[PDB]
Design a protein around this ligand. Structure first.
Ligand SMILES: [Mg+2]
Ligand SMILES: [Mg+2]
Ligand SMILES: [Mg+2]
Length: 154
RNA sequence: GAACUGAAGAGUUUGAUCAUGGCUCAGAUUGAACGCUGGCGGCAGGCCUAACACAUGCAAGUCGAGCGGAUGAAGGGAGCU
C-alpha cells in the first residue's frame, strides 16, 4: 500500500559538554486504503532523513484489518497507557469525525464513517497505539462463528 | 411511507521526555450595550434598573319598548294680520 500521512514531526534535544545536540523525530502512517495499515517512527539529525526512516519503518509490520465496507463492525473502546479511544460505526453520509492522529489512522486504513472520540492524554503516538490496538482486535462475522454455524449467531 | 442521522481538538511547566493538573483558545446563543459604517423591503421585538414620584388628555357605559317630570318639532287648524 502507498498512502503517506505525516502524523507528527518534533524536535528533541540532548545535553553534552559543549551544549545541546538537536534531533528530529517523525511519526507517520502508511496503508493502501483497503484494509492494511501500519505506523512508523524515525529519528535523525535532519527532517527528511527522519521522515524517510519513519516511512520505511511504517512500510514494514503492516497489519490486516477486517472492516464492513468502509465502516466499522461494532463500537470499540481501546486503551494504551493513559490514552483511551472510543469508536463506533456511522452511516454512509457521515465523514470522518475524529481528531488528529485518529483521523490520519482511520483515513489511511480505509474506513470512511467512524464517528470517533478520544479521552485521557492526547499524545499522538499513544493515540496511534490505542487506535491500532482497537482496530487489530476487530473480529467481524464468520470469525466469531468459531463456536457454531453462521447466520444463527446474528 | 416519514416523524432522525449521532461524539475532532490546540497552546502553555522541561536541556529534552512521559504523566498529573490548572489556565487559555477555536462553536452556538442574547429583551443586549458601546465603537466605526450605513441602501431597500417583509415578519417580529423594544425600561432587564427605581412595586421611584407623577403635570395633561383619553381607557366603562348603556336601556325612553321599566317610571314620573320637562324639553317641546312638522302638522291640522282658530283669531288678528
Ligand atoms: Mg488532561
Ligand atoms: Mg524553553
Ligand atoms: Mg419594570
Amino acid at each position: 500500500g502507498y498512502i503517506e500521512k505525516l502524523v507528527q514531526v518534533n524536535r528533541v534535544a540532548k545535553t553534552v559538554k559543549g551544549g545541546r545536540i538537536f534531533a528530529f523525530t517523525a511519526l507517520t502512517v502508511v496503508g493502501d486504503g483497503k484494509g492494511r495499515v501500519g505506523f512508523g517512527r524515525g529519528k535523525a539529525r535532519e527532517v527528511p532523513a527522519a521522515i524517510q526512516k519513519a516511512m520505511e519503518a511504517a512500510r514494514r509490520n503492516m497489519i490486516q484489518v477486517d472492516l464492513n465496507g468502509t465502516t466499522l463492525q461494532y463500537p470499540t473502546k481501546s486503551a494504551h497507557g493513559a490514552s483511551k479511544v472510543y469508536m463506533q460505526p456511522a452511516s454512509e453520509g457521515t465523514g470522518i469525525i475524529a481528531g488528529g492522529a485518529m483521523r490520519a489512522v482511520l483515513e489511511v486504513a480505509g474506513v470512511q464513517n467512524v464517528l470517533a472520540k478520544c479521552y485521557g492524554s492526547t499524545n499522538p503516538v499513544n493515540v496511534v497505539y490505542a487506535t491500532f490496538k482497537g482496530l487489530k482486535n476487530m473480529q467481524a462475522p464468520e470469525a466469531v462463528a468459531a463456536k457454531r454455524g453462521k447466520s444463527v449467531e446474528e
